Specification:
The structure is cut from a larger assembly and holds three copies of chain A and four copies of chain C (41 residues). Chain A is mainly alpha-helical. Chain A is built from four helices and one strand, in the order ααβαα. Chain C is elongated. Chain C has one helix spanning 37-40, and one strand spanning 18-19. Chain C is largely without helices or strands and 41 residues long. The chains are: A mainly alpha (121), C little secondary structure (41). Residues 1-2, 12 of chain G line the site of one myristic acid.
C-alpha cells in the first residue's frame, strides 16, 4: 500500500524522483495503521529486493549504483516491456493461453462432417 | 540453490554479517539454477533455429550460446547471508547483472529480427 | 525514518539513496510459483 | 526457387523433397516459454 | 470384496483399514502435466 | 596492376598463353590495387564509427575489417593473358568474387543499419 | 541522460563536456565516397 502508492514501475526509458521528497511525502499519505511507519528501514531492506526502482545509496562512496540489484534479478529483467517486442512475458502467455483453448474445448475439428456427442461441445 | 551469490566481507571464514553479496562493477552474480537454464536455452534454441535466415540477410551475428552470458564463480548462494550459508556451491554457473542485461536485450533484439521473418514464413 | 544502524545493511534516510524507476527492470517478487498436482509432482 | 547451393543443407527445388503432413507430428516451434515472475525465478 | 491375497499388498476387506479424510492431504494424482510446445521443449 | 589475377595453367613457364584467370570454388580473385582499398576502407571506416550504437542495440556483429574479405594470393594480374604477363605480383591482396559479394552486401546491410540511426542523430 | 558508465568512453551528462563550434573544424563524416565505374575500377 506504500510501494505501489507511488507507481515504482514505468515501461519506457527512466524517470527519477528525488528521494528526500518522496519519503517526506509518504510520511504523510500512509494511514496511521500501516507497518511501513513502524519499521521504515526494516521494510526498506525488504523492499530494495522487490523494487529495482529503489536503489539504496552505497555506504562507502555515499552514491546510488546505476544498476539495481533486486533479488528477482532475472525475472524482473524478463518482464520489462522490451521495446523490440512488447513484452516476452505477455506475448508468450497470450500464445500458450490460446494453445490451451485450441486443444482443449476441441476447436480443432470445428466443422467436422460426422456425428459428434453433444458432450464433445 | 537460488538467488545472488555471496562471499564474506572481512575475509577468512564467512559468518553471517561476514557475508555480503559479491557485488562487482558489472553487477551481482545471480545463480542460474538448473531449470532457469532450460528457459534461456529454450529461448535461444528457438532463435538459433533461424540461423539460415540470419546469414542470408547479413543481420544477426553468429549463433547465441547461453554460455557466453554466464560465468563459473563459486561461493555461497542464497537469498540472504543467513540462508545463503547453507548452499555452498563450487564453480556454479552464475550470470552477472550487466550480463542478465544482454542475454535480455539480445534475446529481445534477435526476437524482433525473427518475429518478422517468422511472420512471412507463416 | 529515525536512524536504526545495523538491523538491516541500509538506512532508509541513509546517505544518497535514490528512487528511480527504469523501464528496464519491472519490480517483481515470486507470485506465480507452480504447485498444481501434475506440475509439482 | 533458383538454385542456391550451400547457404543452407537443402535446396528448396532440390531433388525428391516432399510435402506430406502426418497426423503424428503436429508442427510446432516454441511459443509457450514460461517467463512469469514466480516461474522464471 | 472377496478375499484375493497377493495380487496387491492390501486386501480391501482387510483387517483394520480406515476411510478417514484429513483436511491436510487433499487426494490428487497428476492431471496438470505440462506438454505445451514451448514448455515441453 | 589491376584486374583479375591469372596463373600459369601450363605450370612454371608463364607465357602469353600458358596463363588463365585463376578461378575456382570462390569465384575469381580480382586484384585490390592501392587506391581501391582506400574506398572500401573509407566505406568501412564510416561504419566502424557507429560502433557504440551497434553494441547498444545488439545488431551489427563486431567491427568490419577489410582484411576479412581479401586474401594473399600471388601470380600475374592483368586484364588479359597478354597484358597480365607484365604484372607479376607476389602476395598481392586480392578479393575473390564470392567475397566481393559480402564486402558488398555487408557494407549494404550495415549501411542500412547506420543510415537509420545516423538519421536520428542528425 | 542517465548515467551509463562503460558502454562508451564518454558519459553524455559527464563532467565538463562542452558544446562549442569553431569555424575551424566544420563537422563532417564521409558522404562523397567515390564508387562510379571508372573511378572504383
Ligand atoms: C520514518 O519512518 C519516517 C517515514 C519514512 C518512511 C516510512 C514509510 C514510507 C516509505 C517506504 C520505504 C520502504 C518501501 C516503501
Ligand atoms: C523460388 O523462390 C520460387 C518460389 C518457390 C518457393 C517460394 C516460397 C513458397 C514456398 C515456401 C517454402 C518454404 C516454407 C513455406
Ligand atoms: C467386493 O467387491 C464387495 C464390494 C466392496 C468394494 C467394491 C467397490 C466399492 C469400494 C471401492 C474401494 C476402492 C476405491 C473406492
Ligand atoms: C538523457 O537521455 C536526457 C537527454 C539528453 C540527451 C538526449 C539527446 C539530445 C542530445 C544529443 C546528444 C548526442 C548528439 C546530439
Amino acid at each position: 500500500t506504500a510501494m505501489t502508492m507511488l507507481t515504482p514501475d514505468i515501461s519506457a526509458g527512466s524517470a527519477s524522483c528525488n528521494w528526500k521528497s518522496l519519503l517526506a511525502f509518504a510520511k504523510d499519505i500512509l494511514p496511521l495503521d500501516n507497518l511501513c511507519l513502524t519499521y521504515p528501514n526494516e521494510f526498506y531492506n525488504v523492499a530494495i529486493h522487490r523494487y529495482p526502482a529503489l536503489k539504496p545509496g552505497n555506504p562507502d562512496t555515499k552514491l546510488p549504483d546505476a544498476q539495481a540489484h533486486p533479488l528477482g534479478e532475472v525475472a524482473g529483467a524478463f518482464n520489462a516491456a522490451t521495446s523490440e517486442v512488447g513484452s516476452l512475458v505477455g506475448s508468450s502467455s497470450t500464445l500458450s493461453q490460446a494453445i490451451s483453448t485450441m486443444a482443449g474445448k476441441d476447436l480443432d475439428l470445428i466443422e467436422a462432417d460426422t456425428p459428434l456427442p453433444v458432450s464433445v461441445f | 540453490p537460488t538467488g545472488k551469490l555471496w562471499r564474506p566481507v572481512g575475509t577468512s571464514v564467512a559468518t553471517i554479517d561476514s557475508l555480503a553479496i559479491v557485488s562487482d562493477r558489472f553487477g551481482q552474480y545471480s545463480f542460474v539454477n538448473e531449470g532457469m537454464r532450460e528457459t534461456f536455452s529454450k529461448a535461444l534454441f528457438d532463435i538459433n533455429m533461424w540461423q539460415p535466415l540470419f546469414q542470408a540477410t547479413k543481420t544477426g551475428c553468429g549463433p547465441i550460446v547461453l554460455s557466453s552470458f554466464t560465468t563459473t564463480t563459486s561461493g555461497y548462494v542464497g537469498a540472504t547471508a543467513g540462508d545463503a550459508l547453507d548452499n555452498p556451491v563450487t564453480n556454479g554457473v552464475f550470470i552477472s547483472t550487466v550480463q542478465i542485461m544482454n542475454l535480455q536485450r539480445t534475446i529481445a533484439a534477435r526476437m524482433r529480427d525473427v518475429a518478422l521473418w517468422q511472420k512471412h514464413l507463416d | 525514518g529515525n536512524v536504526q544502524t545495523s538491523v538491516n545493511t541500509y538506512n532508509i534516510t541513509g546517505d544518497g539513496n535514490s528512487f528511480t524507476p527504469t523501464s528496464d527492470m519491472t519490480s517483481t517478487a515470486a507470485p506465480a510459483i507452480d504447485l498444481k498436482p501434475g506440475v509439482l509432482n
